[PDB]
Write a protein that binds this ligand. Sequence first.
Ligand SMILES: CC(C)C[C@H]1c2[nH]c3cc(OC4CCCC4)ccc3c2C[C@H]2C(=O)N[C@@H](CCC(=O)OC(C)(C)C)C(=O)N21
Ligand SMILES: CC(C)C[C@H]1c2[nH]c3cc(OC4CCCC4)ccc3c2C[C@H]2C(=O)N[C@@H](CCC(=O)OC(C)(C)C)C(=O)N21
Ligand SMILES: CC(C)CCC[C@@H](C)[C@H]1CC[C@H]2[C@@H]3CC=C4C[C@@H](O)CC[C@]4(C)[C@H]3CC[C@]12C
Ligand SMILES: CC(C)CCC[C@@H](C)[C@H]1CC[C@H]2[C@@H]3CC=C4C[C@@H](O)CC[C@]4(C)[C@H]3CC[C@]12C
Ligand SMILES: CC(C)CCC[C@@H](C)[C@H]1CC[C@H]2[C@@H]3CC=C4C[C@@H](O)CC[C@]4(C)[C@H]3CC[C@]12C
Ligand SMILES: CC(C)CCC[C@@H](C)[C@H]1CC[C@H]2[C@@H]3CC=C4C[C@@H](O)CC[C@]4(C)[C@H]3CC[C@]12C
Ligand SMILES: CC(C)CCC[C@@H](C)[C@H]1CC[C@H]2[C@@H]3CC=C4C[C@@H](O)CC[C@]4(C)[C@H]3CC[C@]12C
Ligand SMILES: CC(C)CCC[C@@H](C)[C@H]1CC[C@H]2[C@@H]3CC=C4C[C@@H](O)CC[C@]4(C)[C@H]3CC[C@]12C
Ligand SMILES: CC(C)CCC[C@@H](C)[C@H]1CC[C@H]2[C@@H]3CC=C4C[C@@H](O)CC[C@]4(C)[C@H]3CC[C@]12C
Ligand SMILES: CC(C)CCC[C@@H](C)[C@H]1CC[C@H]2[C@@H]3CC=C4C[C@@H](O)CC[C@]4(C)[C@H]3CC[C@]12C
Ligand SMILES: CC(C)CCC[C@@H](C)[C@H]1CC[C@H]2[C@@H]3CC=C4C[C@@H](O)CC[C@]4(C)[C@H]3CC[C@]12C
Ligand SMILES: CC(C)CCC[C@@H](C)[C@H]1CC[C@H]2[C@@H]3CC=C4C[C@@H](O)CC[C@]4(C)[C@H]3CC[C@]12C
Lengths: 572, 572
Amino acid sequence: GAVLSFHNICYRVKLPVEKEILSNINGIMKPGLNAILGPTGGGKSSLLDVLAARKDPSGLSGDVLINGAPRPANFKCNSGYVVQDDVVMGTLTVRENLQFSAALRLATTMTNHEKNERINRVIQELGLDKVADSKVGTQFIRGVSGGERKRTSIGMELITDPSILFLDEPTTGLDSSTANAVLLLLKRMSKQGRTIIFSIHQPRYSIFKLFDSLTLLASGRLMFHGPAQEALGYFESAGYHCEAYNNPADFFLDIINGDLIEKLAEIYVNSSFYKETKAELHQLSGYTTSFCHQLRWVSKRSFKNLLGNPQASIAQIIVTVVLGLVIGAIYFGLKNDSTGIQNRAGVLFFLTTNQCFSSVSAVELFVVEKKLFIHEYISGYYRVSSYFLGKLLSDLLPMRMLPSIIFTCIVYFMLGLKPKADAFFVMMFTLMMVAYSASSMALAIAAGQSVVSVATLLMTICFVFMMIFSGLLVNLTTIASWLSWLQYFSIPRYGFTALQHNEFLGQNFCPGLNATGNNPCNYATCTGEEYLVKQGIDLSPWGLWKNHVALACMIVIFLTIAYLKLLFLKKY
Amino acid sequence: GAVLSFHNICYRVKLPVEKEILSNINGIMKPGLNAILGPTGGGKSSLLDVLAARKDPSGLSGDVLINGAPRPANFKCNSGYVVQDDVVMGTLTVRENLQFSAALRLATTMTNHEKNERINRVIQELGLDKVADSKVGTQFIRGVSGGERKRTSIGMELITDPSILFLDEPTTGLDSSTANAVLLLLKRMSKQGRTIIFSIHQPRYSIFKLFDSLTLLASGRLMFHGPAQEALGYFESAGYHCEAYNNPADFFLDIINGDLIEKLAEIYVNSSFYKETKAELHQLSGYTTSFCHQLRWVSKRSFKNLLGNPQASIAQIIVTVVLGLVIGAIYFGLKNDSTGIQNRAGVLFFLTTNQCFSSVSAVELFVVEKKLFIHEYISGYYRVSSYFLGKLLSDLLPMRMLPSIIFTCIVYFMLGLKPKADAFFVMMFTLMMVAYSASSMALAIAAGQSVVSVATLLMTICFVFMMIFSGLLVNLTTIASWLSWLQYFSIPRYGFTALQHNEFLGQNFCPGLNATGNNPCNYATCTGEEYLVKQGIDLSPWGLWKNHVALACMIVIFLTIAYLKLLFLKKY
Ligand SMILES: CC(C)C[C@H]1c2[nH]c3cc(OC4CCCC4)ccc3c2C[C@H]2C(=O)N[C@@H](CCC(=O)OC(C)(C)C)C(=O)N21
Ligand SMILES: CC(C)C[C@H]1c2[nH]c3cc(OC4CCCC4)ccc3c2C[C@H]2C(=O)N[C@@H](CCC(=O)OC(C)(C)C)C(=O)N21
Ligand SMILES: CC(C)CCC[C@@H](C)[C@H]1CC[C@H]2[C@@H]3CC=C4C[C@@H](O)CC[C@]4(C)[C@H]3CC[C@]12C
Ligand SMILES: CC(C)CCC[C@@H](C)[C@H]1CC[C@H]2[C@@H]3CC=C4C[C@@H](O)CC[C@]4(C)[C@H]3CC[C@]12C
Ligand SMILES: CC(C)CCC[C@@H](C)[C@H]1CC[C@H]2[C@@H]3CC=C4C[C@@H](O)CC[C@]4(C)[C@H]3CC[C@]12C
Ligand SMILES: CC(C)CCC[C@@H](C)[C@H]1CC[C@H]2[C@@H]3CC=C4C[C@@H](O)CC[C@]4(C)[C@H]3CC[C@]12C
Ligand SMILES: CC(C)CCC[C@@H](C)[C@H]1CC[C@H]2[C@@H]3CC=C4C[C@@H](O)CC[C@]4(C)[C@H]3CC[C@]12C
Ligand SMILES: CC(C)CCC[C@@H](C)[C@H]1CC[C@H]2[C@@H]3CC=C4C[C@@H](O)CC[C@]4(C)[C@H]3CC[C@]12C
Ligand SMILES: CC(C)CCC[C@@H](C)[C@H]1CC[C@H]2[C@@H]3CC=C4C[C@@H](O)CC[C@]4(C)[C@H]3CC[C@]12C
Ligand SMILES: CC(C)CCC[C@@H](C)[C@H]1CC[C@H]2[C@@H]3CC=C4C[C@@H](O)CC[C@]4(C)[C@H]3CC[C@]12C
Ligand SMILES: CC(C)CCC[C@@H](C)[C@H]1CC[C@H]2[C@@H]3CC=C4C[C@@H](O)CC[C@]4(C)[C@H]3CC[C@]12C
Ligand SMILES: CC(C)CCC[C@@H](C)[C@H]1CC[C@H]2[C@@H]3CC=C4C[C@@H](O)CC[C@]4(C)[C@H]3CC[C@]12C
């Protein structure tokens, strides 16, 4: 098996206040089962992220060396890593998660039969054969238990057959017998020859008896490294008395807590386990798949997540149908009189600002899947471009095509707008473009963040500053010229100007007029063009289509900013 | 000290699926330190809530009896209870929390000097004298450490000098040496003669050596009850071998988990610790303060929380000032021409719907303080009426008076609305009433819930169905008569109709007119009354003030519904 042998690791970060969180750590990890103990604030998870190259090579100041050689560039694609909180797809089943991982991690050369036999072998080794085709589980659907979610998360990284297998906290978040079952599974894996390296948090003695090698850390300094049975005898030789009926790992943490660390670290420097470790270390020292493949599998997984999550996808269509029926019931039969201007401008304003505010629920998209994106980009399933295009083609495109089609098909014929063939399609296309553009601004603000609330609030602030300049509330010509340049930034202004220019052309709003008051008395606003001029809207068809080209360019700019915020994200 | 002696407790709930979660449990708890162990799903916290009467007496089916007598009605006011997650005020300091608890729990007869000496004694017994006047801590301000927060939460219930002191999970959420310090404090309390009863979760042996009496529970059934030293010897006599270097409490849970419960519960029925317990049990068996006082202290605490939380109180005033300056900059100098109708109706619509949507941030009020309300109502600090009126007089009144005054004083004179003395005050009063009414609907929907998101979303749905019927988007006379009755439910319609009737009276919107087109040609909308009629608004002053009486009655109805949702809440 592999022998991961790290020597003289110094590590430091910038919080810019610079601080070392690993001081001087060396150790050898045999084929077998290697554990890392310590407090939360100690460097246990930091050292585990360092050995799997999950932290940036800028701060790392020592050689990490496997089997006699430094770590190659293919190492992250070769050595699996298992996150603390599970990143499995809750809506997909256990076989389809392994199908996804086998499709992206393994080569394109292999047969589907070979990958299916590999998945069957991996799901046989885990004991997930009873639940091989049930859903993993979310809030709305009941699913598989937490220990079998953790076995699924291990099995996703077992597909590529890793030589070294890392594990961040496989015990925590679980109950006791569940944790013992997971660790007995890990021991059965480690007897094969696979080198398991894991960090944990306050284990039991039934856990602690299983360990092959131990590494204790505290406040960034190495406290012990040797075989795990030898550790209690070493701390008896250090002078700390162990009491009867006490867990030795709890005794190890009780040494750290003080019933000092610079006093206790130097005691390990004067050990027999330290000179032997240096005597071993100085002996040793002195993409895969194409683009369309990644886009197809990412888009397939995200669409299957969209079907398997029924509530936030179906409920938007239900609210769209109900609100379309309500707007068809209130504005029913738009007349051509003095109320016709107010009703038509009001319903077009409601439809565009409804599209804008209903596109706030796409903040959720790149924020819920953030840790899964980081883990799967470092582990090397896909590029950022294929993730981005797959998750646009999957979750953004149909869930913004369908509500705008439903709004136009419902509120068009109940209201009785301009009864032409193409005006219907221009209205449908304008609502679809304002939906895409508002949702693309949502993705531009929301991508690469961890919380939903600040991005949602910022979207709503931007929209209430756009709807002032939309043109119903203020007249755009009466804004001062040092402030009227902000009207180009606003998406409802383009959607609403396009809909007003679509609908107000052939209409007359003075019944029985036939020039009674001599082109009626200069204050009438009778024909639709006379309204549409004094709003500041052009009458030529470029006055229609410049709104759509402005929306298309805002889609392109906002999706490019969203892509650059995903691409320049701190992945480590 | 007190001897809490419970006998033959059977307990069951309705989830309506009916299920027993405590089967047949009896035990005696001496003066000293009593622990309750078990799994999470076991009845440890349920039995601890039963003994302190924190669960309803409907499901309870056995006598709980202290010191030879059943529990009186004053018992919750006499025996302290300490919640798992701390309910201390994060913004108040450690001395002012104890000042609050001493003001509400103790009598009105006692001197302020006596209560201050009591608080000094309690804060001396805890070891909080170094941090006696520092803030407890929230997100924005750094504060006291978690163990000293837990000592503060114990000290809040130590004020009334309880005979019996309950504690739900005093170890969890903490680190190891912190937990040992808290439990050594508890042992120092229990040596005085105070009967401490607590539930915990997987303790250490340094914890477990301190116990005076033990009660193990599993799946609703009693597993052991006796002295805590005797428990391991009893389970050796049961036939379960304990291994060396193993925590006995972890061994107790490992017996439960199965390395059955109906097999293992009957073994305790055949004990020597069970017949002795029945031999002891059958021997034994066979507001404070006025209303204005509670309102004063609750309102004082909530106002001090409003000052000590600077961000969500100051940031609303900053956003109000900035948005008032923006609306003063866009709509600057409202002219009297064909754009005058559109600009005035637009800015009045923006101001009212701004008041409505900015009153969504009062959903937070009764939802953040929900567990603190339940705990302090059961422990008996205040009635529901005094909590409700204090938290209206503290957080609702000034934070909705100040933004409306700021909006009116800024956007009034920059826009140049109707330059009178009383029109300014009618505008300020209408904005204040629409703020109160929207926020009162927020409190009516939001009170008595635990999550913020569903109530916030429901507020926003109600507001977008109110703003259609406000009167700018649709003309209210052109709505069909089977649907035009919904216009009375909507708060922006009353605020916006009152502002339009306030502002559109003395205005003329046709310059240089002097009857050129013979009362100009029937389609002009020149004078303000001709606009204000065709909207459906009365011209008499009752057409102004019926909006304010509708807003006042919606304030009264919504605050009454909020009060009834607090009063009829399931407190147990
Ligand atoms: C769809 C509608 C009922 C809610 C939608 C929405 N329209 C708005 C339109 C606005 O124009 C104003 C009308 C008069 C002048 C301007 C203003 C605000 C809004 C909002 C709020 C927004 C929201 O807060 N969230 C999303 C998704 C909510 C959702 O998913 O709801 C269910 C029940 C779970 C399905 C949304 O759709 N709205
Ligand atoms: C104050 C404003 C900038 C935000 C406010 C608000 N106005 C609205 C007005 C609306 O009318 C439409 C305007 C054209 C016709 C109808 C519609 C929606 C809104 C919203 C959103 C609402 C909200 O989402 N909640 C609080 C946020 C306060 C807050 O805590 O944010 C800071 C920055 C941290 C202080 C709010 O006040 N807004
Ligand atoms: C009438 C409206 C809603 C039509 C909108 C078009 C939608 C439904 C289309 C456009 C792009 C499509 C996706 C394109 C590519 C793939 C990859 C394939 O391996 C599974 C299907 C999947 C994920 C498609 C699902 C359906 C899809 C999202
Ligand atoms: C979004 C999806 C569902 C619909 C897309 C809208 C399409 C079909 C619409 C939007 C713009 C429309 C065009 C707008 C103007 C004209 C000029 C006139 O000679 C009628 C046909 C023609 C050329 C229309 C054809 C249909 C059209 C291209
Ligand atoms: C009429 C006006 C006020 C409407 C609002 C337009 C302006 C203010 C909006 C529209 C596009 C927005 C930007 C979109 C994308 C990003 C990238 C993100 O990493 C920070 C916020 C930032 C930089 C946004 C800031 C605000 C923004 C520039
Ligand atoms: C990151 C954010 C700020 C990017 C915003 C880009 C905006 C401001 C740009 C992108 C596309 C642009 C439009 C493209 C084309 C035209 C037609 C021209 O005859 C008038 C200007 C107008 C209507 C532009 C206005 C400004 C515009 C909408
Ligand atoms: C006119 C409107 C509807 C078109 C929609 C614009 C879409 C299709 C555009 C805008 C931003 C674009 C992305 C911008 C940057 C990159 C990085 C490049 O290495 C691969 C392509 C990729 C990922 C682009 C794919 C296509 C893209 C998503
Ligand atoms: C100009 C505007 C903002 C004025 C609004 C009035 C506000 C500031 C007033 C009205 C009611 C007042 C409260 C009434 C009673 C008490 C109890 C007292 O023991 C502490 C002050 C406290 C909590 C007051 C704080 C200030 C208060 C909230
Ligand atoms: C909320 C706070 C800050 C302001 C309260 C507004 C008060 C002061 C306003 C609102 C309604 C106003 C009244 C409305 C109508 C009239 C009739 C006329 O003869 C002028 C005075 C008088 C009688 C006003 C006096 C001031 C008044 C009572
Ligand atoms: C113009 C119309 C559509 C405006 C909307 C008004 C109606 C639908 C609103 C206003 C007041 C609201 C109620 C206020 C209080 C409560 C009590 C709460 O426990 C359940 C919701 C419930 C029962 C709300 C339901 C919706 C409600 C009745
Ligand atoms: C729980 C919710 C639904 C309660 C809502 C109560 C609403 C519908 C009630 C309470 C007060 C009422 C108003 C009280 C007084 C008047 C004056 C009268 O000349 C016309 C009706 C009008 C304007 C009422 C309309 C309906 C009204 C606003
Ligand atoms: C016209 C507007 C501004 C007045 C505001 C209405 C306020 C003051 C009213 C409306 C609802 C009322 C509450 C309704 C019910 C009760 C329960 C009772 O046992 C004590 C009083 C108490 C708690 C009331 C106090 C006063 C109250 C909060």
